[PDB]
Ligand binder design. Structure first.
Ligand SMILES: Nc1ccn([C@@H]2O[C@H](CO)[C@@H](O)[C@H]2O)c(=O)n1
Ligand SMILES: Nc1ccn([C@@H]2O[C@H](CO)[C@@H](O)[C@H]2O)c(=O)n1
Lengths: 302, 301
């Protein structure tokens, strides 16, 4: 009867690529995928075996409902997602070829994921084993979550260099933060020129109250640091990359899930890297063969 | 108990525009609309009051189903549209700004609208009052429709200069064709430099067996020609244009509907221009397209 609550954005990623001249309806291939940091994390959690509830917002349009339906039939409990009237479901348009040419994001219904909304589900939220939130939601909403978590661990996905900032004044209310290099630099105000700077950055995070830091450094790997003193590097699982999208989402799901499973920090980080690799090796934004079994198999195969 | 059958493509048009440049997550606005020539025509027919059945193809994906649902309580009977497994629903991606920049069409699922499929609905098709087909479907499928229409008038939308050509060898099996300038030039092999050339083009169409020609000339207007001798011009309803998509779709719906209503050719053409205008004045289908509101637009001349 243990459930996980994910609070974030649910999107539709539309990817189009040609077989290219401008001012012409050029024949190509278009894919509709389910996306959104929060939604993706919820789905990866469900594929990891946890009972996951999504608290998101989608429009009164029909395509929103089919986003919810697809997600529900991925295993996610979507029956508390807010269907918002009059406004259209958010989306991530993306023009590729072979290398993305351009991308557009329409994500303002995220501001409908309000404090009043979450307050309507206060007790349900406060009786989860862990709450996962992304920084796509408004500063007020994130503030409400962190203010009303009732000692339920909040895992936060910073999303981008632009949207991580709302987290800076609230690191003492966050159980685990997973920033990349740029996001960590943006938050700390300290340059991460190289691997010699992670200690100083992490020390900045810990002095500002962050319980746990999971710092993805790209090729450098993952540097993890606990305010109680434990820290270390984990070198990347070397992989066959085909997509890069859904990497961090899978890693976040891995961290939250492993936490719920009672796993220690370091091994949870390694496992999360396993998840991220599995995501990196799959045509879609989420890998439907993400499961405890084959990430574990990817990890013992070291 | 009179129904109309529309056989064509059902798409999802996704339009995105920013507010600006490249290699970056650019904040903007994205719109999902229901589209596809056939589907649009069916919807306009339903808004005109006719009982319209759509014979189209959509993927096993969920967004296909939401296209179908949206279309259904737009008034269209979609319960015979083919849900095709394994393949994804066709779509029209379009990158704009303030002026259309680039566009992609993924429409290979149109090839699932097969002869076999339509043959599974032979009798239902053959007892409609009129069949509307677009040239997005395969040459074989259009050939099957025209070969098995059982004297039910087939109205054909040429769609584009690229796809109108499959109609060239079969103008004698078509009740009404609605080409634009470029499509007419492409079909006839005769240049339409100016308004003095419509006669020779139309004569070419009639000599190759076309019963009725409805030729949209843009600013020049609409030239209509009947193989039995009636022909004429109709000047445009002058309008407040905000988008242009769904114009020809609305006109085709107007022609088919007016035909079913027993209206004469010319008056049906004028009415159809009214419909196309109503479409031109609404951010692909106008939900206030109706006999009332078109007649009001036309009597207001
Ligand atoms: N500001 C943004 C940008 C992107 N996304 C979603 O993130 C997914 C890939 O991680 C993509 O599926 C995309 O929809 C998001 O939630 N917020
Ligand atoms: N080859 C094509 C190109 C476009 N379309 C559909 O036509 C509508 C505008 O008339 C748009 O909604 C678009 O989806 C089509 O059915 N086939």
């Amino acid at each position: 009867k243990d459930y996980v609550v994910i609070i974030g954005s649910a999107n539709i990623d539309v990817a189009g690529y040609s077989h290219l001249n401008y001012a012409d309806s050029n024949p190509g291939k278009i894919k509709f995928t389910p996306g959104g940091v929060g939604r993706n994390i919820a789905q990866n959690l469900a594929l990891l075996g946890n009972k996951a509830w999504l608290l998101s917002a989608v429009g009164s349009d029909f395509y929103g409902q089919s986003l919810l339906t697809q997600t529900n039939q991925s295993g996610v409990y979507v029956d508390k997602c807010l269907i918002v009237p009059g406004e259209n479901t958010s989306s991530y348009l993306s023009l590729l070829d072979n290398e993305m040419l351009v991308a557009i994001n329409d994500m303002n219904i995220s501001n409908a994921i309000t404090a009043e909304y979450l307050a309507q589900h206060r007790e349900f939220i406060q009786r989860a084993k862990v709450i996962v939130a992304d920084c796509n939601i408004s500063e007020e909403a994130l503030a409400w979550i962190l203010d009303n978590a009732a000692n339920v661990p909040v895992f936060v996905d910073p999303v981008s260099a632009w949207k991580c900032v709302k987290v800076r004044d609230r690191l003492n209310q966050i159980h685990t933060l997973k920033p990349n290099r740029l996001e960590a630099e943006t938050l700390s105000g300290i340059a991460l020129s190289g691997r010699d700077d992670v200690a100083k950055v992490a020390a900045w995070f810990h002095q500002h109250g962050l319980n746990r830091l999971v710092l993805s450094m790209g090729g450098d790997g993952v540097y993890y640091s606990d305010i109680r003193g434990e820290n270390g590097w984990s070198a990347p699982i070397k992989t066959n990359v085909i997509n890069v999208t859904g990497a961090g989402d899978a890693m976040m799901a891995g961290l939250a899930s492993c936490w719920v499973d009672g796993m220690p920090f370091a091994e949870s980080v390694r496992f999360a890297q396993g998840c991220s690799s599995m995501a990196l090796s799959c045509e879609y934004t989420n890998n439907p063969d993400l499961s405890i079994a084959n990430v574990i198999s990817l990890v013992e195969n070291a």
